[PDB]
Write a protein that binds this ligand. Sequence first.
Ligand SMILES: CS(=O)(=O)c1cccc2[nH]c3c(c12)CCCc1ccc(CN2CC[C@](O)(c4ccccc4)C2)cc1-3
Ligand SMILES: CS(=O)(=O)c1cccc2[nH]c3c(c12)CCCc1ccc(CN2CC[C@](O)(c4ccccc4)C2)cc1-3
Lengths: 296, 296
Amino acid sequence: EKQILCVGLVVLDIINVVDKYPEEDTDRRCLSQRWQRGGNASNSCTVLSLLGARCAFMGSLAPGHVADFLVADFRQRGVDVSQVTWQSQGDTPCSCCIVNNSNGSRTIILYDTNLPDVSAKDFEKVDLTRFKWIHIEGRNASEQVKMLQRIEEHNAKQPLPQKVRVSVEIEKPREELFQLFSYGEVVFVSKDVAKHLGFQSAVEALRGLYSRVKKGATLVCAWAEEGADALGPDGQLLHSDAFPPPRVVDTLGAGDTFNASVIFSLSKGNSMQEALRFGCQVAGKKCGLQGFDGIV
Amino acid sequence: EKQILCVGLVVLDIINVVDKYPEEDTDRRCLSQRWQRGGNASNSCTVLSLLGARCAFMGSLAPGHVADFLVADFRQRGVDVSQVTWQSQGDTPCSCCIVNNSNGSRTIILYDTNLPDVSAKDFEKVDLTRFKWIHIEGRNASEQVKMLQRIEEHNAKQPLPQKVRVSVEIEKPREELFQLFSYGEVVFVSKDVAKHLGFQSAVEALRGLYSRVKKGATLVCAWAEEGADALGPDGQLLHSDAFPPPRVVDTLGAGDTFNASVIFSLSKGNSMQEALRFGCQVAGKKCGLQGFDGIV
Ligand SMILES: CS(=O)(=O)c1cccc2[nH]c3c(c12)CCCc1ccc(CN2CC[C@](O)(c4ccccc4)C2)cc1-3
Ligand SMILES: CS(=O)(=O)c1cccc2[nH]c3c(c12)CCCc1ccc(CN2CC[C@](O)(c4ccccc4)C2)cc1-3
């Protein structure tokens, strides 16, 4: 019963739900406030655990009351925390999020600049035989490239059912990340990255970025209310319409819900078309709920 | 030596300093993030301690890691916490603040609705002989009115140097707070309260609200970059121009810096004109600094 490893960020999300987006220099009372475990790779673990998958998290944490709460939340959700890279120096990332109840918008201000990242040296200790899928949240690209090369070396010595499946996510429009396109069987590219590169649709983004992926890889792009699209080695464009809820209340973590649902579906042997549909269905349902718990 | 008691709110302020105000549904990294002890009465204690006054705080806290940090901060600053009302049930207030460093603006989203307030019964335990000044942050007006009546009864039996000096702040435009104008020798009314009552200037606000204050009392109204004004029993309008810093970087806690500095100056025997000037000088300096620490 092999696990799914998600390598990336874990952050304390201090979420304020408001009735209207605040105007600069004003004071208001929130409708509600919650302290939620966040970060793209950590949120993928939450969704994977809710779907019934055995999953592990690999990311950095600094000792303190914040890390204890985040670890206690991971444990309660049954996410394995043995690969956590404990840092003697630095600060656990923390974000302040504004969730607008009226349209489901999420405005994030993140503090994640004072913590050493998972190194290639740290990743060298990971027993790759306990994982069937490794998802890397694109962050410190130069070190993560070495982590991806290690999996490639491992998989070349393994028979087809013993090969670890690899997915990569390019979510932030940072130049350094673009070297990660070349790795993984599944590459997730955000609407934000695509729009920053000049793309006005998911189909445009897939055609424009496919030459960057590994030979035989599938490029995946979710475009919010326009749905989600994919392009694999057969050159066929795949699409699923979005499944918006009756009332969009919380879009915070919707992207991760999509990524984790696609990984879940693909790891179970479903096709890319089935994974695209499932991804839109689960993230769609998530957009009509506060947090993640109501998806199942 | 007698202390200055500030009765009111203590909040966990989570401050994100940004280079520009975030647009709804965007993601940004902060320039810096800090976990600062807030609340209006709580902030006045910080400024009073920095100025050299022996001050105490009276407010509610719920047990947890947040309260421990807030208490540890108060203690480190030499603010007496013996009058803190520990609540068995509820949550310590927490706000998420966006400080824009290009203009000094502060946007606050506060969670403070799940904690019992300091009662008149809790205030009955306060030894009024240990305090020369009691400042009340207007909140639960009906209970605070009984606290104010207790001080009045006490002072009537005391010789002039043994009477406790009383100030009240009316910061929030809540109807309930308007009964507090009738109490205290010094009444602080915010620009926000005045603008909500229809007043377009501090002078207009003072002439329109003076009939509400106690006989012999002084009404004080700070009007941000327009300075601060006052009106006492002699019917003379007093004014101090604002002292803006070279660069306005943080206005969070500016009003509390003004209030605490006026209290400090008045408790030392300075005139209202000298207190108004000092209040604008200290709050003005504070605005060019992140936090409070750089005022002295
Ligand atoms: C895999 S997926 O399910 O395709 C998906 C993945 C990641 C993110 C996603 N967002 C949304 C979806 C989605 C799909 C359906 C739900 C939905 C409804 C409405 C809006 C649009 N709203 C939400 C704030 C909004 O973007 C806004 C912007 C600026 C100001 C105010 C609101 C205007 C988006 C989504
Ligand atoms: C006792 S006191 O010192 O008089 C004082 C007491 C309480 C509050 C106070 N605010 C300000 C002062 C002040 C006075 C000096 C510093 C200052 C400079 C500039 C502005 C005006 N700026 C600050 C963001 C601003 O209010 C804004 C609004 C909306 C969008 C962008 C910026 C437009 C205010 C103050």
